[PDB]
Structures are given as C-alpha cells and as structure tokens.
C-alpha cells in the first residue's frame, strides 16, 4: 500500500533550523513528486513546496529563501529543511503525494509532525494513576485513568493495554499550565468486576524527550 | 494568490439530514477544486477531486458541484462519523491554496454526564503537588458547569478544564476539571468536592471525598 511516514515531533529553538524525513513505501520517488504542507493556528493549511520525480523543486513564494527539499530515491526518503524559524512557524508539517505524478490532489498524507518553535527546554512528563474507587464506580462501571503532567512540548501519545483497550477511552486535549508546561489526563471506563482480573496500563510516549512510561493503574488500598 | 472563503464557519446538524459546505473563490477557477476531511487527530483525507469527481474508498453520500467561483460539498445523509472539519483547495492558479475550513457539529438528544472524582495519588504528593480530577463522562450538549469546594470554600482560578472533541459514534463530549494545589494546602484541608451542573440533570451532582 502507499504510505508516507514522517520523523518524530520536537522542539526547534528560534532562529534555528527544522529538519523532517518522509520515508515512503508502496511507490517510487522516481515516479512521483512529494509535496510538503503545513497546518498552523494562524494560517491553517498552507502548501510549502514539492520535490518532483526528476529532482526539481518548487517552493511557495514566502519560503523560497529558507526552504530546501532533497531526496534519496534508493532509500525512498525525502528531506525537508527550513531555516531561521520564528514562533509562528509552530505547526503540523505533512509530506503528501498526489494521485498522479504531475498533479496536486493529495490522496496520500504523512501522519504529520508537530513542530514547536520555542526558546524553552524539552521536559518529559510525570505519570500518576487516577485510581478506580467507589467514588469512581456506578452501575457496575468503574472509571480509571492516568495523569500526564508537566511536559514540553506537545505532543504526547497515550494508549491503554498496548493498544488492546480502545473502547471507552478518553484522552483529553492537553492544557498549558502557568509554568509553561502541558498536562493531560486519559481516562477509560471498564466493568468494575474486571478490576480484580484484568490489568490496566496506560502507555505513555513523549517522543520529544524520548520518554516512555507504562503506568499500571489499580484500585487503591 | 487565490483566496478561498468557506462558509459558514460552523455547521450544526442532526443525523440523517442533508448538509452542504460552501467554498467561494476570489476569482474564477473553473472546476479546479478539491475537498478534504479532517477528523480529530487525523491527517487530511481527500473526498472529491476537480469539484465533482469521486475518490476511491469515499462513501457515496459525499458529492460536490460548482463552477467558476461558487463550489459546494454535500453530504446527503449525515452520520455521526462525519464529525470533522472540511477544507477546500484550489489549483487553477499557482500556488495551490486552501480554505480556512468549516467545522461540522452533530446534534443529538440531551445526555447527562456521569460524574467521577479522583483524589491525588500518594505518588504525586511526594513531588509536592496535589491534583484533584473531576470527570464528566459522555454528555450532551457541551455546556456544563464545574464548581470546586474545599471545606466549603469556593475555589476560583486554581482549576483547568479540558473537553474532548465530539465522539464519532455517540456524539457526546467528556470533560475533565483538574484542581491543583500545593501539597501543603492539600494537607491543611479535609473535604474535597466538585459540583456539576448540566441541562440533563434535574439537580446538581456532587462528588466528594475526605482526604484520608
């Protein structure tokens, strides 16, 4: 199948440069162009440029001076690089492939890469259990969760039981605390009778700081 | 550059109803417009190419029309899984440009929240901070009030709320309210309570605990 997979999210210091890799499969870079689009709060969807089958590049006008796109056909990799970022370059960056080799209807997208431009430092989260109790149990259903606190920058991925538990899961959007660090909770509702039999583990991955925690959550003593 | 203006900014409709999205261009662009869907935490998904041409894998309920400057994306019978943002894109004129998007919200019957409260863990208390979490699960509509009280003292300015996007299956929302205190403050008090007010409740729901 046609797939585009991007390198991970991270923090870029103001004035420094941004680098992202798009590794593609299910097609050849010698036969298709690969485009780059970003999505920001201020400007929304914005086309940045493209590297064509034969190696030529076009860059959108405002980015022509600080953008370069290169590629490695044999490795099926496309390399995106942007210079001197300011805070408003904070955005989700995508690589994309059109339906035909010459066109611009983007049928295939990378998963996106959230890039944060900030002078701050990267910080992994602490993970605390939100334990099930009688005060979180009603009608045979217990709620439980994980508190993912004090990290920077976004994003954090959270799953439960290594992906096997998805039903009734709610991972809330992170809030920005006054410290400038983010915090979120992820909750799930399960049958209360399962609490003594099934294990519940929230899998937390904060890619920017290379922090991975599996937090087991149990009814408190 | 071509400016694409999408209207309205937000659409709110009931399931099974027909819905349509407008994209107006600053100058004529033939039928060189494509439509995309973006779901929560997702990458854009190509729905229609060249104003009206179908895309493999896209449900038949999606269709497009329009010529010149006035374009329309339609969903003949909306389903809950259609909760998303919708974007148009022109490519008659370099560089290709996108609209600012239209958000598609779904209506449903009133559903009261199930309320749960969580004391801070002993692990967090070690770090010197106490977070108390109140959970409002699976409710509609989105509007709700959460009031925190500690030993009958109304709390203000020391909590944060987060609301999920609409659920793609049942069209509900869930909400968290997190009360944050220093461990010192937390230990100086006994009764912790969040009171929830919502349209679907005949009276406020209070969940509480005593520290220890």
């Amino acid at each position: 199948q046609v797939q585009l997979k991007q390198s991970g999210p991270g923090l870029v210091q103001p004035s420094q440069s941004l680098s992202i890799t798009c590794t593609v499969s299910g097609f050849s870079l010698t036969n298709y162009g690969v485009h780059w689009v970003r999505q920001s709060p201020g400007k929304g969807l914005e086309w940045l440029g493209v590297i064509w089958s034969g190696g030529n590049t076009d860059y959108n006008t405002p980015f022509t001076s600080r953008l370069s796109i290169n590629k490695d056909n044999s490795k099926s990799q496309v390399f995106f690089k942007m210079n001197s970022l300011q805070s408003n370059d904070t955005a989700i960056y995508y690589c994309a492939r059109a339906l035909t080799y010459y066109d611009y209807e983007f049928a295939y997208w990378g998963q996106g890469t959230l890039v944060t431009v900030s002078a701050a430092s990267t910080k992994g989260p602490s993970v605390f259990p939100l334990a099930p109790s009688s005060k979180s149990t009603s009608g045979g259903t217990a709620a439980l969760g994980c508190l993912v606190k004090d990290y920077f920058p976004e994003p954090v991925t959270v799953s439960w039981n290594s992906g096997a538990l998805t039903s009734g899961v709610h991972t809330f959007p992170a809030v920005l605390q006054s410290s400038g660090l983010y915090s979120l909770s992820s909750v799930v509702t399960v049958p209360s009778s399962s609490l003594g039999t099934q294990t519940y583990i929230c899998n937390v991955n904060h890619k920017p700081s290379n922090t991975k925690v599996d937090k087991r959550v149990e009814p408190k003593s | 550059d071509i400016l694409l203006t999408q209207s309205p900014v937000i659409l709110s409709v009931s399931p099974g109803e027909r819905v349509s999205f407008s994209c107006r261009a600053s100058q004529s662009i033939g039928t060189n417009i494509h439509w995309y869907q973006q779901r929560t935490n997702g990458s854009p998904r190509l729905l229609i190419k060249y104003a009206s041409e179908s895309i493999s894998g896209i449900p038949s309920r999606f269709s497009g029309s329009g010529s010149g400057t006035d374009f329309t994306l339609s969903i003949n019978s909306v389903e809950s899984e259609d909760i998303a943002d919708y974007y148009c894109q022109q490519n008659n004129n370099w560089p290709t440009t996108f609209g600012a998007g239209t958000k598609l919200e779904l209506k449903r019957t009133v559903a009261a929240p199930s309320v749960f409260i969580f004391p801070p863990s002993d692990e967090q208390l070690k770090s010197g901070t106490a977070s108390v979490v109140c959970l409002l699960n699976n409710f509609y509509p989105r509007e709700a009030k959460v009031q925190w009280k500690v030993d009958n003292a109304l709390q203000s300015g020391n909590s944060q709320e987060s609301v999920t996007e609409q659920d793609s299956k049942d069209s509900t929302y869930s909400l968290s309210s997190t009360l944050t205190l220093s461990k010192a403050d937390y230990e100086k008090h006994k009764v912790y309570a969040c009171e929830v007010t919502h349209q679907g409740l005949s009276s406020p729901v209070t969940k509480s605990f005593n520290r220890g």
Binding site: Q39, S40, P41, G42, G44, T90, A91, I92, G112, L114, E154, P155, P173, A174 | V9, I10, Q38, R39, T40, N41, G42, D85, G101, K103, E165
Partner: peptide, 12 residues
C-alpha cells in the same frame, strides 16, 4: 475560531 494543534481540529 482557529486551528488547534493539539486536537487537529478547529476551535469554537
């Protein structure tokens, strides 16, 4: 309102 980087959704 604007686009939210956390949820990849438009606010308000």
């Amino acid at each position: 309102c604007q686009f939210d980087l956390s949820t990849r959704r438009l606010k308000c």
